[model samples]
Target: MVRQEELAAARAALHDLMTGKRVATVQKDGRRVEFTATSVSDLKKYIAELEVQTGMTQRRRG
Candidate 1:
């Protein structure tokens, strides 16, 4: 599994891709996910939830 600290790089790379509008869904394994995020502000707050998940502590790169 990918560690929490590793998500930042990937998240940063795709940061621009999320602008304007985007939809990321968690499925029940059977149902369809609805279109979400009609604006950027909504998406920014959603992504901020990952702050703890990122576990940013010490510098991780050389």
Candidate 2:
């Protein structure tokens, strides 16, 4: 199963960028991922990937 907390953190990081943060950071299991405004698309794709792993994609469709 995917780590829900990590998924949530990733979502939050994406939100931060969307809201105008210069950089967004997601930390999970001692690993850190960062995103800049210029990399919004990358962040979005990462979130999508996480959603798939967490079954959030199906949840959203339902």
Candidate 3:
């Protein structure tokens, strides 16, 4: 599982890109990844993955 802080940082980076920033960086566990406004879709995908890893996504009732 990913740390909550790491997920938060990734969300913030995505927000930066959405809010007029051409590029944003997310650093997690010593790994650095960059996202550009031109690739917002990919950034969103990354965030979704992070959400899953961090258990932030809601679970369906069985």
Candidate 4:
């Protein structure tokens, strides 16, 4: 969690691998959505939305 670059790289790799796969997204209140994506762009969009929703901002400190 301390290494921002590594975190981003791993996330990017996962997004690439999951682009054409299906995943179960569990919500905060016990809701789940089985997402089907077929492209990297689609995967990135989902990840971006999750990042915003979860307030995933960069921290300057380790």
TM-score of each: 0.30, 0.63, 0.63, 0.31
lDDT (CA) for every model shown? 0.49, 0.69, 0.70, 0.51
Per-residue lDDT over 1-62 for candidate 4, one digit per residue giving the tens place of the 0 to 100 score: 43444346537556645665454342323455444444447656755765654464545543
**In each prediction, how many residue pairs overlap at the backbone (N, C-alpha, C within less than 3 A)?**
0, 0, 0, 0
lDDT of 1 by residue, 1-62 (tens): 34443445435534544674355443323465544445546446645766755565635662
Query: Which residue runs does candidate 3 get wrong by more than 4 Å?
Result: 55-62
Q: Which of 2 and 4 is ahead in lDDT? A: 2
After TM-score superposition, the amount by which residue 26's alpha carbon in candidate 3 deviates from its true location, in angstroms, is 1.6
Show the lowest summed lDDT stretch of 10 residues, model 4: 21-30
Give per-residue lDDT, candidate 3, residue 61: 52
Which residue pairs overlap in candidate 2's backbone?
none
Task: Please tell me which predicted candidate would have the highest lDDT against the true structure.
Answer: 3
Question: Candidate 4: where are CA atoms >4 Å away?
Answer: 1-38, 56-62
lDDT of 4: 0.51
TM value for model 1 = 0.30
lDDT of 3 by residue, 5-55 (tens): 777777777668767889777775688876678777876787687656656
RMSD of each: 8.2, 6.0, 5.2, 7.6
